[PDB]
């Protein structure tokens, strides 16, 4: 897993139907780091340090073994920084 | 903390049992009691995530066989700045 | 058998014969020859005890004669 | 009290027995005796509803067999303000 | 005395005989006579209970074959203070 | 009102029951209670035609089984101007 | 009067019914209530002879079926002066 | 007179009857009334042996069918001086 | 009010239950508790006839199965002034 | 008044009929009409115990066939002094 | 006289006869007459042992057929010095 | 405390057993032992509601087979304030 | 000497007999004798549990066939301090 | 009395019956009555814990067959400080 | 009861001959006292004559522009019979892309080509010059 | 508070749960935790009889599903002064 | 006294009940409590022989069904002087 | 942190595994290790509520199949002040 802070939300209307009705959140390892996007399996508010799982694990953390997700927020860190 | 525990019940007796249990079982603050209509009463508590998880668990168990029972017991770790404005700040 | 001077009833002696054959209880000062030798409840009957140890009044009278505002 | 009790009788002798019984039995005021005509005499007793109930029942049980007898034993717990103008306030 | 004796009769002739046979018979006072209506006349006599009982039996036997006949013969041994209003307190 | 309701009854007790029922059942005014003679008492109300109908029907039901009962229950939706002279203007 | 009515009963509830009945039926005075023992209560009245006969026939009928019942109902028209020492002069 | 006559009865109404009967029947002296307990009342008279015998015979018949009845009718022509301590000197 | 409702029971436990049941059930005031003797205890309340009717019904049902039980339940809508002397005014 | 009467009904139209039947029936005051929630309306009346008894029986009989119907008809002859704080004093 | 002799009877009349036969049959001293409640009366004598035995056989034969009868006849030749506290010393 | 527990018995021996079991089981206070007559002895205890429930349960079990036994075990968590004037404050 | 022995009997003769037997049979002091009403008398002893268990056995043997008999033979090995107020002191 | 008793009910008639029974059974103060919605009403009482237990067990029994009945009957012996804000707290 | 009768009758039509058995508190009641699952029809089980705002699948109650069989005029024979017409017997084949959807087609081109060519045999039929699978 | 409430558990985790549940459910004092051996741990609390009843019930429910479980739940509403020696005054 | 009574139980809750039931039952001193291991707890009492026989029977009945129950209840009337060393003198 | 996690095991090897796993799972402080008796060993940690919840869940999984197994894993987020007396502060 990686510790990434939520920066904002992302919205793709043309997203594949396999993504389902699942929120997507821009994330980064620090402010200024490359911005990734993760399926928000938990409900995370912007500014939340979060735990993000990579491929295979992220597909079942996002709801199905066949889910199109290589990144998913599996939790919010009780306290970081 | 900014976590939310909500325990909806059918009636206010299960809600008051749910809110006693939640408040005695963890360091959470009862922020509101809402009458929604149709005999649904939501007791909402606010505190750090672990406290809210312990509290919601105790409350659900407590209010389950009291009266018409538990409709829902739900934990929200972090609550959006927008959901804050639909949430009672202090109990009434 | 209590030998010695006897205070019991005799055929020869008289004046000691009121209640001589009566069963008195307590110390036996006379022989069982004449007197001989489970009570369970009070033997005196009482008015209250004679009857096991509904509302009467002016509402009870004229059962079907009166008409008018009913009460319940 | 405003409850009205009324005993019509066939004669004044059953009526006087009824007025006596009603007054002795319960806390009722004798408000009037009326000669209706045809040998009908009414006795009207105004008191509280339980009192008037007790009075009318005692009166009926009393005048039932005296004389020609009892025509009616009636209670009206509230009489309309209109029916008041046809009710005697005090007996003569 | 406060006992009341009452004889109801069909007509006036049978009640002037009963009124006469009453007051002669025992120590009673004729307090009044009333025309009830429908052909009934009531003669009332106030005395002690012993006297009124003699008077009513006398009056009753006296008027039972006079005229149309006797309707009621009633004795009251104490009259309530409220029936007093519906009773004739008459020099008559 | 211009309509007339009338309930004749055998005695005063059935009539007071009729008047009470009638005057509570609709907006009618008790204009008279009349001792006709022979033990007939007539209660008269004047109201709108609809009120008098509701009222007379109510009065008939109330007094039917009280005392000697009801003789007549009648509605004249408009009395002639001349019948008004033979009709009471307020109760006695 | 000096006649003596005495009603014994099995209880104070049948005795108070009897006292009320007796002291409303005739012109008698309640001179005493005595608790004999065994549950026997005696209500003694003093009046003229006819008055006391009427009162004691009114008391007996009344209390015959109130509570445990009526034991005795006895009139003594004259009482020896000796017996007056064993009789209550007032009910306290 | 030194003789004792004693009538025990179940209740006080029969005892008052027996005391009147006894005092009237002979020249005895009503010397006391005792509430034994269990609803037994003992009336005691003192007079000459001829007087007391005459009195108790009358009292036994008088109160045999008044109230609950006679328990005992007894005559002691001479009481031992020891017994006079447990005997009432005057009625209370 | 001047009505009188009275319950007689066999023992004190049933009577304290009756008094409590009655004074909880209606607008009555407990005026006395009497040990008649031989295990009869009479509890008495004075109120309005409707209140006492409601009070004695609830009191009689309450004490019916408590201890040895109910002997008598009895309402007197109007007590004669003479019975007030033998009636306790306030509980001692 | 002290007695409370209450008619619960499913809907206002059944309750208005009960309020009218109750207030017409006896001398009771309509102290409140409350919308409980879920279509339950309670009509509350305070009068004497006799009137409230007669009234609540009138209401229950009237509203039973009106609309959805009657849920309850209850009389509390004297509410505890504490229950007064949760009882209306005047309808709104 | 240290012996005690005791007769218990159903009533006071057998007890007084027993006290008379006991005190006249031997040199005993009548010390107590107790109402034990329930219609039990105990006459207690105190004399030498032979005197007491003779006295109690004589008392029992005297009161066996007087009134309700003899419950117990019992002699105690020496009484413990502690039972003498609960024993009366002079008849009252 | 204000809860009242009452164990009536047939005799003082079953009531001294019941009082010992009550007082030892919980923190109650014997507020009075009563002789009601007839043999009935009532043991009244006043303590907190939890204590009185425990005490009366212990008392009823203890005296059930002792002597003539238990008539009634009865708890009133709060008596009316008028039922407290017929309650003993201290044992005699 | 803290244990209590208690014999209830039907009469004072069986009780005095039991008291004698108990006090003679073991080291127990006779503390009191209580008349309970209805003919029950209770003889209480106070001593050690063996002294008392031996006295109450000896006492019940004495008074079983004396008079009307024994009702209860009970031993309380330690008496609660509260129950000592309802217990006669030793000068009795 | 910081304990809390609550009784939810379907309708208000059941709830006023619960409040009345609760405040008549034990030493509990009525703090509030609430309209939850969907026809639910909650009466809340506060007193010592045992008192609240007795009160809520008696309220449930009384309100169970009145109206639509009992939904819940609960006791919270110690309420948390937070829950006091969501609780009515208004005997006054 | 006698005289002027204003009680409900079947001979005098008007506003008091309606709601018979639904009205309580009448003199008669006081004397005696002594549907579709969905508002809108199923979408599959109906086809509307005029679509759009002319739809009649939903049941609008009230005063609503619908017309009983009693009412005549505007549509029906009053629009249908005005002009004479003869419907001839010429129902003929549609030449269209949709009618040619199930035309007979020649055997599908295949590929025996080897080597790396992106030779997918599972997708839509791409074709090269001469009908050669591509 | 002098009532004791003891819960016995198999293991310490159920006992700490019971201590917590008992101390938070009622105003009771945790007086001790005893390791009895054989994996039995007793938690003893002390408070008023109602607080101890509530606390023990709470503790039992709470510990019934934590670990090996509940062996016992007991109350001693009054504890002998001898047992205060084997009871722990303060948790240590 | 030097008699030893010894209740043994599976757990301490049954043992505190036994100790308390043994100390309230008779005049005995709790001399110790032992944790023997394996769940076993032995409460030991010392007093005169009958005191101990009545305590060890009260204790056994009390704790018989409490916790895991009773293992042993045994009385030794005199213990050898060598067994006094393996016996505690005062509780710890 | 003041939250209490605790894990009980059937032995010490499972307990050490739990303590190690709990201390390693989250920032919690191993405050005590207890030999309850019978082979029950409890490990207790104190930390922030989320940390303790994370610790106890990981400890229980670690020791479930280690040795004879796990008995309990309990989290208490708010511990009462009274229970903190029976909780160790530093391990031994």
Sign of the torsion formed by the C-alpha atoms of A8, A13, A16 and A19: positive
Between CA F43 and CA F11 the distance in angstroms is 11
Closest CA to L13 of F17, M5, B74, R17: M5
Q: Is G72 helix (H, G, I), strand (E, B) or coil?
A: strand
Q: What is the resolution of this structure in A?
A: 2.8
Contact yes or no for N77 and P50 at CB 8 A? yes
Nearest CA in chain F to O2: F74
Cβ atoms within 10 Å, residue G53: 22
Rounded alpha-carbon distances, angstroms, from residue L48 to K17, L28, P55, R35: 55, 7, 16, 41
B84 torsion bin: left (phi>0), alpha (psi -120 to 50), beta (else): alpha
Say yes or no: L25 contacts chain M, CB-CB below 8 A: no
Q: Which residues is N45 bridged to in the sheet? A: N5, N30
Between CA E63 and CA E45 the distance in angstroms is 15
Q: Which of residues 3-42 of C touch F (CB under 8 A)?
A: none
Six-digit token pair at B34?
């809402």
Q: In this structure, are residues H23 and H30 in contact, taking their beta carbons and an 8 Å threshold? A: yes
Six-digit token pair at N68?
């639509």
Tell me which DSSP letter residue P84 carries.
Answer: T
The secondary structure of F10-51, three-state, reads: CCCHHHHHHHHHHHHHCCEEEEEEEECCCCCEEEEEEECHHH
Neighbours of chain I (3+ CB pairs under 8 A): C, D, G, J, L
For Q50-89, give the DSSP string: HHHHHHHHHHHHHHTTSTT-EEEEEEESS--TTTTTTS-S
Say yes or no: H91 contacts chain C, CB-CB below 8 A: no
Residue I22's H or E segment, with its range, is helix I12-25
Between CA J56 and CA J44 the distance in angstroms is 9
Six-digit token pair at P76?
């001693």
Q: In this structure, are residues D32 and D76 in contact, taking their beta carbons and an 8 Å threshold? A: no
Minimal CA separation from Q39 to chain R, in Å = 9
Between CA H52 and CA H49 the distance in angstroms is 5
Q: In this structure, are residues G23 and G2 in contact, taking their beta carbons and an 8 Å threshold? A: no
Q: In this structure, are residues Q55 and Q24 in contact, taking their beta carbons and an 8 Å threshold? A: no
Please count the helices (runs of H) and the strands (runs of E) in chain L.
2, 4
Rg (CA), chain R: 12
Say yes or no: K2 contacts chain C, CB-CB below 8 A: no
For G8-70, give the DSSP string: EESSSHHHHHHHHHHHHHSSEEEEEEEE-SSS-EEEEEEE-HHHHHHHHHHHHHHHTTSTT-E
Q: In this structure, are residues D3 and D46 in contact, taking their beta carbons and an 8 Å threshold? A: yes
Contacts of E27 in chain G (CB under 8 A): none
Contact yes or no for I26 and J51 at CB 8 A? no
Which residue in this structure is represented by tokens 């001989």? C36
Q: In this structure, are residues K23 and K5 in contact, taking their beta carbons and an 8 Å threshold? A: no
Contacts of R19 in chain P (CB under 8 A): none
Start-to-end C-alpha separation, chain B: 20
At residue G22, what are phi and psi to the nearest 5 degrees? -55, -45
At residue F14, what are phi and psi to the nearest 5 degrees? -60, -40
Six-digit token pair at K16?
């007084």
Which residue in this structure is represented by tokens 């039980």? I69
Breaks in chain R (C to N > 2.5 A) come right after none
Contact yes or no for K39 and H39 at CB 8 A? yes
M63 torsion bin: left (phi>0), alpha (psi -120 to 50), beta (else): alpha
Closest CA to R53 of B87, B3, P44: B3
Closest CA to F48 of F64, F17, F73, F26: F26
Q: Is N30 helix (H, G, I), strand (E, B) or coil?
A: strand
Which residue in this structure is represented by tokens 């005995």? Q28
Between CA F24 and CA N60 the distance in angstroms is 40
Q: In this structure, are residues Q33 and Q91 in contact, taking their beta carbons and an 8 Å threshold? A: yes
Which is it for strands A72-76 and A36-40: parallel, antiparallel or unpaired?
parallel
Write out the residues of chain A at the interface with chain B, using a CB-CB cutoff of 8 A.
42-45, 48, 76, 78
Neighbours of chain K (3+ CB pairs under 8 A): C, H, M
Contacts of J37 in chain B (CB under 8 A): 37, 39
Say yes or no: J9 contacts chain O, CB-CB below 8 A: no
Say yes or no: H24 contacts chain G, CB-CB below 8 A: yes
Which is it for strands L3-10 and L30-37: parallel, antiparallel or unpaired?
unpaired
For E21-72, give the DSSP string: HHHHHSSEEEEEEEEEETTEEEEEEEE-HHHHHHHHHHHHHHHSSSTT-EEE
Q: In this structure, are residues D2 and J27 in contact, taking their beta carbons and an 8 Å threshold? A: yes
- Assess if CATH 3.30.230.70 describes domain B1-85: no
Say yes or no: D64 contacts chain C, CB-CB below 8 A: yes
Between CA K25 and CA C16 the distance in angstroms is 10
For H37-91, give the DSSP string: SSSEEEEEEEE-HHHHHHHHHHHHHHTSSSTT-EEEEEEESS--TTGGGSS-SS-
Six-digit token pair at F34?
């009349």
Between CA M72 and CA E47 the distance in angstroms is 64
Between CA O103 and CA O108 the distance in angstroms is 14
Q: Which residues of J56-91 are buried (b: 16+ CB within 10 A; e: fewer)?
A: bbbbbbbbbebbeebbbbbbbbbbbebbeebbeeee
* CB-neighbour burial class of residue R61 (10 A; exposed 0-12, middle 13-18, buried 19+): middle
Which is it for strands O2-3 and F70-76: parallel, antiparallel or unpaired?
parallel
Q: Is R32 helix (H, G, I), strand (E, B) or coil?
A: strand
Q: Which residues of G19-49 are buried (b: 16+ CB within 10 A; e: fewer)?
A: bbbbbbbbbbbbbbbbbbbbbbbbbbbbbbb
Between CA P81 and CA P68 the distance in angstroms is 33
Closest CA to H24 of H67, H74, H69, H61: H61
Say yes or no: K42 contacts chain H, CB-CB below 8 A: no
Tell me which DSSP letter residue I77 carries.
Answer: S
Six-digit token pair at E24?
């002669």
Chain centre distance of CA J3: 11
Closest CA to B89 of D74, O90, O20, N85: N85
At residue B23, what are phi and psi to the nearest 5 degrees? -70, -35
Between CA F77 and CA F49 the distance in angstroms is 5
Contact yes or no for Q27 and M3 at CB 8 A? yes
Closest CA to C69 of J61, F12, D82: J61
- CB-facing half-sphere around the CA of Q61: CA atoms within 13 A: 10
Q: Which of residues 63-82 of D touch F (CB under 8 A)?
A: 71-72, 74, 76, 79-80, 82
Strands in L3-10's sheet, in edge-to-edge order, are: L30-37, L40-47, L3-10, L70-76
Q: Which residues of F27-54 are buried (b: 16+ CB within 10 A; e: fewer)?
A: ebbbbbbbbeeebbbbbbbbbebebbbb
Strands in J70-76's sheet, in edge-to-edge order, are: J28-37, J40-47, J3-10, J70-76
Q: Is R35 helix (H, G, I), strand (E, B) or coil?
A: strand
């Amino acid at each position: 897993m990686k510790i990434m802070q939520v920066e904002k939300t992302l919205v793709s209307t043309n997203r594949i139907a396999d993504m389902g009705h699942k929120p997507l959140l821009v994330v980064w390892e620090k402010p200024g780091a490359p911005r990734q996007v993760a399926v928000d399996a938990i409900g995370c508010i912007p500014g939340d340090w979060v735990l993000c799982v990579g491929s295979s694990a992220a597909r079942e953390a996002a709801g199905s073994k066949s889910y199109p997700s290589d990144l998913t927020i599996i939790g919010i860190i009780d306290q970081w920084n | 903390g900014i976590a939310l525990g909500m325990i909806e019940t059918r009636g206010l007796v299960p809600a008051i049992e749910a809110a006693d249990a939640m408040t005695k079982a963890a360091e959470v603050r009862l922020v509101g009691r809402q009458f929604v209509g149709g005999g649904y009463v939501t007791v909402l508590v606010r505190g750090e995530t672990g406290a809210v998880n312990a509290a919601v668990r105790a409350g659900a168990d407590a209010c389950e066989r009291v009266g018409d029972g538990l409709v829902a017991a739900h934990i929200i770790a972090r609550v959006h700045s927008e959901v804050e404005n639909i949430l009672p700040k202090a109990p009434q | 058998i209590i030998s010695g001077t006897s205070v019991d009833a005799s055929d020869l002696v008289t004046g000691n014969e009121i209640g001589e054959q009566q069963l008195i209880s307590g110390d036996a000062y006379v022989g069982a020859q004449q007197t001989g030798c489970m009570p369970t409840d009070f033997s005196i009957q009482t008015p209250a005890r004679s009857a096991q140890n509904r509302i009467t009044g002016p509402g009870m009278l004229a059962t079907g004669l009166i008409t008018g505002t009913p009460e319940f």
